[PDB]
Amino acid sequence: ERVVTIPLRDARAEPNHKRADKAMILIREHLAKHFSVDEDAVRLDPSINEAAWARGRANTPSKIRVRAARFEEEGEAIVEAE
């Protein structure tokens, strides 16, 4: 478990009306990589979803501080806002 800061600037590569969606993907990929786990094993607590969609589907925050834990037999991660 540790607190990480995810930059979401790469969401700008996707059309503007869908930034929120791409953000949620970048977040999953970031954690999967930095916690050495499969993207399928990363669980995003709704708190994170609401943070990214706060200003609608087209206006994502530039970064997001997230608190994630890593454990269990298969190796998984659980993440949430802070």
Q: Where in 59-78 is the site for RNA (CB under 7 A)?
A: none
Q: Select the residue interacting with RNA from 7, 15, 71, 72 (CB under 7 A).
A: 15
Q: Which residues pair with 71 in a beta bridge?
A: 76
User: Exposed, middle or buried by CB within 10 Å (0-12, 13-18, 19+), for 34?
Assistant: middle
The answer to whether the CB of 66 falls within 8 A of the CB of 10 is no
Interface residue with RNA, options 21, 34, 81, 82 (CB under 7 A):
21
Q: Which stretch binds RNA (CB under 7 A): 30-38, 43-51, 66-74?
A: 43-51
Q: Extract the tokens encoding 36.
A: 């050495």
Footprint on this chain of RNA (rule: CB under 7 A): 9-10, 12-18, 20-21, 24-25, 28, 42-46, 48-50, 52-54, 56-57
